[PDB]
Design a protein around this ligand. Structure first.
Ligand SMILES: CCC[NH2+]Cc1ccc(-c2ccccc2)c(Cl)c1
Length: 326
């Protein structure tokens, strides 16, 4: 069968804590009064969630209300428990209240408001420095949640809110987040296609916090090379092929040999043979002002097939790419 794996950092944080911390199924959720909140406007729509800008009428303060289509109670409980556990962590979205509609009884999560700047105007004005600055703010959030025994599992630009004027960053949407337990086999149907780590695409279930480090490398590559998304797969199988077109098929076979992974037969006719590409080949006139040897060394240490060989969030924060920050 497949070779077992465990995280290189924060491996046993949940093992040494009481069940109350990680047993989200047994957590008691207490709903506030939705009458304290007046919905202003629709901010977005997810699979089972509608996000609104709201007013807390009791203090005239702006909040964000995430109304969830209750399709799975267990999932809702998991998200609430994780949000409560992480509350007050650096750059983590703050859950302020948990409420139900007196009538429809739909669950709704109330969060601190984030004045997210339009990224379409932001992407062109961001400098080498701004990318280093915001990448470090995301690392703060990830080192924190991993130290708390949680993996986000949905790291992507749509889950990162930036108030550029106040240089404020928040990692949101903890709906796919999970407690890390060493040796546990997780569902690979997590993260958004372009940000899915090779472990997920080869169906290697014993993954850890390092999944988030792959996803972060994908956002970093798209930002520094101005190529969105960086790995543009059309399905989950093709997504591995797009990765192999960059990292090469040689290191891919080394990774699946190391963990005795059985490669799905659907990869037989699409994978082909690809050489390992130098990161310098993605440098062009449109992006050379954001690229540096430090950035390429940093990216090379995140985008690795072997989830164990990737930098942890703490090792990443210590990289020379961040010397000019904070
Ligand atoms: C509602 C869409 C929110 N998205 C905002 C956003 C999120 C992340 C980034 C970012 C990605 C990589 C490195 C540095 C920053 C940016 Cl530029 C913009």
């Amino acid at each position: 069968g497949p070779v077992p794996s465990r995280a290189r950092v924060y491996t046993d944080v949940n093992t040494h804590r009481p069940s109350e911390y990680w047993d989200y199924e047994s957590h008691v959720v207490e709903w506030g009064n939705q009458d304290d909140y007046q919905l202003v406007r629709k901010l977005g729509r997810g699979k089972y969630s509608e996000v609104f800008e709201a007013i807390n009428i009791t203090n005239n303060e702006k909040v964000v209300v995430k109304i969830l289509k209750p399709v799975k109670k267990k999932k809702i409980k998991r998200e609430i428990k994780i949000l409560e556990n992480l509350r007050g962590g650096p750059n983590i979205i703050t859950l302020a209240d948990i409420v139900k509609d007196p009538v429809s009884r739909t669950p709704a999560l109330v969060f601190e408001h984030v004045n997210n700047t339009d990224f379409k105007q932001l992407y062109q004005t961001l400098t080498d420095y701004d990318i280093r600055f915001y990448m470090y703010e995301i690392l703060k959030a990830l080192d924190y949640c991993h130290s708390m025994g949680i993996m986000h599992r949905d790291v992507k630009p749509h889950n990162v809110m930036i108030d550029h004027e106040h240089r404020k960053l928040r990692l949101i949407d903890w709906g796919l987040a999970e407690f890390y337990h060493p040796g546990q086999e997780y569902n690979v149907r997590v993260a958004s296609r372009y940000f899915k780590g090779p472990e997920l695409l080869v169906d290697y279930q014993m993954y850890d916090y390092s999944l988030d480090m792959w996803s972060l490398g994908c956002m970093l590559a798209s930002m520094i090379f101005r190529k969105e998304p960086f790995f543009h797969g059309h399905d989950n199988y093709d997504q591995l092929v797009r990765i192999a077109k960059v990292l090469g098929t040689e290191d891919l076979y080394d990774y699946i040999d190391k963990y005795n992974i059985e490669l799905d037969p659907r990869f037989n006719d699409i994978l082909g043979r690809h050489s390992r590409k130098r990161w310098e080949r993605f440098v062009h006139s449109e992006n050379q002002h954001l690229v540096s040897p430090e950035a390429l060394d940093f990216l090379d240490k995140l985008l690795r097939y072997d989830h164990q060989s990737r930098l942890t969030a703490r090792e990443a924060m210590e990289h020379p790419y961040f010397y000019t920050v904070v």
